[model samples]
Target: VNSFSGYLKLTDNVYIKNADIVEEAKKVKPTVVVNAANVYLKHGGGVAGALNKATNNAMQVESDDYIATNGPLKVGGSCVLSGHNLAKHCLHVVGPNVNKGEDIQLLKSAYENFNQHEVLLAPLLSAGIFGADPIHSLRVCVDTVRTNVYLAVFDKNLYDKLVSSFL
Candidate 1:
């Protein structure tokens, strides 16, 4: 079942690939997988949730440990933890809670706190329960993200819009 999964070159440094980020994180590669996390750093939903399940919830130990030391991760704050089986680490970056009337700048601030890595597997942050416009979220990701990125996508709807952007 070979599909048309060729990547869309989103910019000089950003590339959109038809890869599920959860699976990619499981691979041993020089990558900093981003978990679009919550203020409480709970791996309950979205990328964070999926990652938690993938590793058999082992990552939650690290999440809990981080909270025990630091406080609840504020909007735009980021934390780091072991990759379980990764080449480097998983970066949990807290995005804006658009539901709170917070918006893109906080998303940008999340990126602003990042330290460079070999490759960052970044998803469209705030596109889940955060209620951010996916199209705008995509743009914000491309501009705000430092380091070269491989934008990961899954859903056919989001994939179609990505292709249309190139078209």
Candidate 2:
């Protein structure tokens, strides 16, 4: 017997890589929307294609209405935005070491763009864990943004470690 929570766990990750996740999100007509990171747009295509590879589904989109960012807009650094992508704000801000306080500056920018209650999905933290404590890194990030956050993890080990803490 599986509880709803167990099924929910699988669903989150399943949809994270689902192309329709965005479309479904649109259907819901949410005022604030956020996505878990690791939804790579790839060198060849955008979110729909990326999701297709993950879920084996053919999804398409022709407009750019959602907002996208590299996550965290820190001071004294730069963010790169490129490729055929769509977002109201596709910010790409890079900062100092993840362990260092400079990275938190990105959170400030994130908060400024959207309120604490607004939804947000940040992928940079996973990238930062290479240099900083994964748990600590996530905590610092969550604290920086008062809004709800969802961390997208593609690696099974990294995903397991992250979820273990919740247990």
Candidate 3:
């Protein structure tokens, strides 16, 4: 179900919560809804794919226009775009891939390096196909965020583990 177990204050105004990230982004109206992206900023699967589908390709179209003008984001790099129907804005972050090895730092930077205010919601970067250990990614995410961040979790068991002192 799309519900929450609870939340924990990570640091400053940063928080980690067990909830539906997509749904929370809607309810809270975060300044930016983060999309876990690839270095190519490709919109294929996982969180980015879901969001792109939701926007009926507006998200992907914008991402393409961005790359045509500049270039795809390197690992840990990011760009902000108008969210169309999903949010006020969207932040796309390219996280590290395990095939590249020992790049959790990049994943951390993806969540931390951006500048913004108030609320932002993101998934645990690199924990899906990119393959960073979920628990480690959670800690790294908590450590580096400077803004009021929420780690909106999608998995119930994962959320339970996180909120129940698993970290």
Please provide TM-scores, in order, for all candidate models, with all chains considered together: 0.86, 0.41, 0.85
Candidate 3 lDDT at 18 equals 72
Query: For residues 1-167, could you state the per-residue lDDT of candidate 3 as single tens digits?
Result: 22223567766655787776666766766667888888676889888888788888988888888889997777888888887777889888888888678476677677665545456778888877777788887777666776667787778888777667654
Q: Which pairs in model 2 have colliding backbones?
A: 73-106, 74-106, 79-92, 79-93
lDDT of 2 by residue, 63-118 (tens): 11122334333342323232122222222223233444445445444333333334
* Model 1, position 132: C-alpha lDDT score: 83
Candidate 1 residue-wise lDDT, 1-167, digit = tens: 21223567778767787677887655535457788888777888777888878878888887888888887988888877777764368888888878888766787787765545646776777776777877777777677766677767867778788668753
Which portions of model 1 show Cα errors greater than 4 Å?
1-6
Q: Listing every candidate in turn, what is its Cα RMSD in Å to the true structure after a full C-alpha superposition?
A: 3.8, 9.3, 3.6
In candidate 3, residue 34 scores what lDDT?
Answer: 88
Clashes of each: 0, 4, 0
Best by lDDT: 3
**Cα error, candidate 2, residue 77 (Å):** 6.4
Name model 3 segments beyond 4 Å from true: 1-8, 99-102, 115-117
Residue 5, candidate 3: alpha-carbon lDDT:
34
lDDT of each: 0.73, 0.34, 0.75
Worst 10 residues of 2 by lDDT: 1-10
Best by TM-score: 1
